[PDB]
Amino acid sequence: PGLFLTLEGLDGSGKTTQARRLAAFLEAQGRPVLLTREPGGGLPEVRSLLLTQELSPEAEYLLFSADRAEHVRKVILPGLAAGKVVISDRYLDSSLAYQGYGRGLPLPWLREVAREATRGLKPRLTFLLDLPPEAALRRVRGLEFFRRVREGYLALARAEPGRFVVLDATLPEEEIARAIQAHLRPLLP
Amino acid sequence: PGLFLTLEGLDGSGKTTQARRLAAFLEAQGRPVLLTREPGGGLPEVRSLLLTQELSPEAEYLLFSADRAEHVRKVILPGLAAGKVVISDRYLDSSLAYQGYGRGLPLPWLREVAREATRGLKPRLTFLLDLPPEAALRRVRRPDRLEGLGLEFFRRVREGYLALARAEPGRFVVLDATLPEEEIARAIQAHLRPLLP
Ligand SMILES: Nc1ncnc2c1ncn2[C@@H]1O[C@H](COP(=O)(O)OP(=O)(O)OP(=O)(O)O)[C@@H](O)[C@H]1O
Ligand SMILES: [Cl-]
Ligand SMILES: [Cl-]
Ligand SMILES: [Cl-]
Ligand SMILES: [Cl-]
Numbered sequence: 001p002g003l004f005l006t007l008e009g010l011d012g013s014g015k016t017t018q019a020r021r022l023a024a025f026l027e028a029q030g031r032p033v034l035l036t037r038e039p040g041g042g043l044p045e046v047r048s049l050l051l052t053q054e055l056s057p058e059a060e061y062l063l064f065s066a067d068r069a070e071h072v073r074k075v076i077l078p079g080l081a082a083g084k085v086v087i088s089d090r091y092l093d094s095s096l097a098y099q100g101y102g103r104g105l106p107l108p109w110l111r112e113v114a115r116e117a118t119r120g121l122k123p124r125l126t127f128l129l130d131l132p133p134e135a136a137l138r139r140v141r142g143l144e145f146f147r148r149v150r151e152g153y154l155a156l157a158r159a160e161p162g163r164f165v166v167l168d169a170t171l172p173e174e175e176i177a178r179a180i181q182a183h184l185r186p187l188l189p
Numbered sequence: 190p191g192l193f194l195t196l197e198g199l200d201g202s203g204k205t206t207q208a209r210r211l212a213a214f215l216e217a218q219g220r221p222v223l224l225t226r227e228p229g230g231g232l233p234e235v236r237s238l239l240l241t242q243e244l245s246p247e248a249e250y251l252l253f254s255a256d257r258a259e260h261v262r263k264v265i266l267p268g269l270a271a272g273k274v275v276i277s278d279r280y281l282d283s284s285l286a287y288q289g290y291g292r293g294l295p296l297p298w299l300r301e302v303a304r305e306a307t308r309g310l311k312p313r314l315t316f317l318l319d320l321p322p323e324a325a326l327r328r329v330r331r332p333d334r335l336e337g338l339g340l341e342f343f344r345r346v347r348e349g350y351l352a353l354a355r356a357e358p359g360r361f362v363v364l365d366a367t368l369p370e371e372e373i374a375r376a377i378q379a380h381l382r383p384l385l386p
C-alpha cells in the first residue's frame with residue numbers, strides 16, 4: 001500500500017502551496033497523509049548547513065543525500081508501509097536539477113550516489129510546476145543559473161514523461177490544484 | 190480486469206501508427222490485445238453510410254453514436270472483461286472534436302447522447318497526438334467523409350481536442366506529434382508502464 005508523490009520546480013513555482021492544497025484535499029476525503037519536505041525531512045540539522053560559509057556543491061549534495069537517505073528509511077517508507085499518501089516538498093529531482101544542470105556536477109555521479117541513498121525509491125508521480133526564471137524571481141524574492149535549472153527539470157521530464165506531470169505554474173492555483181487532483185483520481189487508494 | 194486505451198488526433202498526426210505500434214509491443218510481451226477503431230469497430234457498414242449525398246451533422250453524429258454504442262457492447266466491454274488491453278484508434282473525443290467543435294453541434298447534446306451510447310465508459314488514458322493542422326494536412330490526404338473542408342475546420346478540431354484535454358488533464362496525455370516517431374513511442378510506453386502491470 002501507500003502512494004509516494006513529489007512536487008518539483010524553481011523557487012517560487014508554488015510547490016509548497018500545491019503540496020498543502022493536495023494534503024488538505026486528501027485529508028478532507030479521510031485519507032492518511034504524510035506531508036514532508038527536503039532538505040530537513042530525514043536529518044533536520046542539515047538545514048543549518050545549507051546556510052553555511054561557502055559550502056562546495058559536491059559537499060552540499062552529499063549532505064542532501066545523507067538527509068534524503070535518512071528521510072527515505074525512517075519517514076517515507078514507514079509512511080508508505082502504513083498506507084499513507086506521502087507527499088514530499090522536493091525530492092532527488094531537486095538535487096539533479098540544481099546540482100547537475102545548475103552547478104554542473106556530473107549526472108552519472110549524482111545518480112550513482114542517489115541509487116543507494118534513495119534505495120531505488122522513485123515517486124509514483126512528480127508534479128513539475130514549470131515557469132520561467134524571470135517569473136520565479138518575481139514570486140520568491142543570476143538568471144543564467146535558474147535558466148539551466150529550469151531546462152534541467154524539463155530534460156528530466158523528457159527522460160521520464162510517465163512519472164513527470166508537467167504543469168504551467170503561471171496558471172491559477174485552483175486550475176493547477178484541480179489538475180493535480182485529476183491526475184491522482186485513478187491512483188487512489 | 191482489463192485496460193481501455195484510446196489514441197486521438199488529426200489524420201496524419203501519427204495516432205494510427207502509434208496505436209498499431211503499441212499493439213505489437215503488447216503482443217511481443219505476451220499481453221492479450223484488441224486493436225480496434227472508429228468509425229467501423231461496432232458497425233463496419235456505417236463507414237459507407239458516412240458517404241451520403243449531403244449528410245447532415247445530426248445524422249452523421251447519430252451514425253457515429255450507433256456505431257460506438259455497438260462498439261462498446263460487442264467489442265470493448267467483452268475485451269476488457271477478458272483482461273485484454275483494448276486499444277481504439279478514435280473514440281468519443283473524435284466525435285466531440287469533429288462534430289462538436291468542427292461542425293458546430295452543441296456539446297451538451299453530444300454528451301447527453303453519449304451517456305447511454307458509451308454506457309459511461311471512459312478510457313484509462315487517451316494519447317492525443319497534437320500538431321498544427323497545416324502540418325497534419327500536408328502529411329496525408331483527408332478521408333473522403335471530410336472532403337471539401339477548409340483549413341479553419343481542422344483548426345477548430347485541433348483546438349477542440351486541446352480544450353477537452355484541459356477539462357480532463359488526468360485522462361488526456363497530450364504529445365507533440367512533430368517529434369521523432371521513436372520518441373513518441375517511447376513516451377506512450379512510459380505512461381503505460383505503471384498501468385501494465
Ligand atoms: N498559481 C499561482 N499563481 C500565482 N501565485 C502563486 C501561485 N501559486 C503560488 N503562488 C505564490 O507564489 C509564491 C511562491 O509559492 P510557494 O512558496 O508555494 O513556492 P515554492 O516553490 O514552495 O517556493 P520555494 O521553492 O522558495 O519554497 C507565494 O507567495 C504564493 O502565494
Ligand atoms: Cl517515466
Ligand atoms: Cl494518423
Ligand atoms: Cl471519454
Ligand atoms: Cl511539418
Ligand SMILES: [Cl-]
Pocket residue numbers: 182183356357358359360361
Ligand atoms: Cl481527467
Ligand SMILES: [Mg+2]
Pocket residue numbers: 015016017
Ligand atoms: Mg516552499
Ligand SMILES: [Mg+2]
Pocket residue numbers: 060061064094095096098099
Ligand atoms: Mg542537492
Ligand SMILES: [Mg+2]
Pocket residue numbers: 361362363364
Ligand atoms: Mg499532458
